[PDB]
Subunit: 171 residues, 2 copies
């Protein structure tokens, strides 16, 4: 609704509709701030006159196509990226509906940052954990909800490791 | 040392050395995230291959040239921008040496975001207050340090207003 992506070679061009200049800049800003990491597309150019962002085309399958086939190693890698975004202070949003926004090949790429916001304690990992439990039925809410409460309280490396192992044992 | 700025018409073009590629992305990222506000330059283009950013040239005088002539209303406007950055979670850095990075005309523009970082409680306002007191000698360190300690504890609008009025009274 906010934008259209067209693929031209190995580049994806995301053009926002004119009403959504605000989201255009958030996408450009957060992609720029995440270029030191390998879990976002490369950013090649921005054109505010056309509200166009030129970026790397990401080959692979969206998570919604493979979520039930994914092994524990791969899920752990996705949890690491959510945790990284938590630590960076970037709340990507809609991480409980990542169906079309995590692209899986030999690597894991997150796409679509146009709703990102800065926050002290982001909800990337716990939004994703709701999705993960919704698709894999790892456990009942009361157990998952307790696990998310403990991570949120501590919110350090130790709290994360406990959540990580306590999620992945279940698979 | 990180970059060279050249002015071509109404555009300032900043080119980084390759060693400072990640400062290029911070400048691009934070300028992008601040385009919804009027206190940064407009961003026009990025070129990651050349590490070049094209933005608005800002007409006006740097704060170091006018700091002792600035009235209380104008200082309050600069304090507001620091607070805004604090609230947004963006620590610009080097705000205790803003000498060439606040440009004052009819409006107030902050420039140079290449050292910015995200954090829960940024130090923009407490860094700027140290500079402000250093140039205007408004109060003794111990009093300022007491005022800054209280602002950092509360860190809400109320804490800010108390800081704001208690700074501006001295002129």
């Amino acid at each position: 609704r906010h934008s259209v992506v067209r693929v031209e070679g190995d580049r994806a061009i995301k053009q926002f509709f004119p009403a959504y200049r605000y989201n255009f800049w958030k996408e450009a800003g957060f992609l720029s701030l995440l270029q030191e990491f390998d879990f976002v597309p490369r950013l090649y150019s921005i054109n505010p006159e056309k509200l166009e962002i030129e970026m790397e085309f990401i080959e692979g399958r969206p998570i919604k196509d493979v979520i039930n086939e994914l092994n524990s190693e791969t899920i752990g890698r996705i949890l690491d990226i959510c945790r990284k975004l938590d630590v960076l202070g970037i709340q990507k949003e809609e991480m409980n509906h990542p169906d079309r926004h995590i692209i899986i090949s030999d690597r894991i790429v997150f796409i679509d940052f146009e709703r990102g916001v800065i926050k002290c304690r982001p909800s990337n990992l716990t939004q994703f954990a709701v999705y993960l439990n919704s698709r894999l039925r790892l456990m009942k809410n009361e157990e998952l909800k307790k696990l998310l409460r403990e991570y949120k309280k501590g919110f350090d490396d130790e709290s994360y490791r406990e959540l990580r192992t306590q999620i992945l044992q279940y698979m």
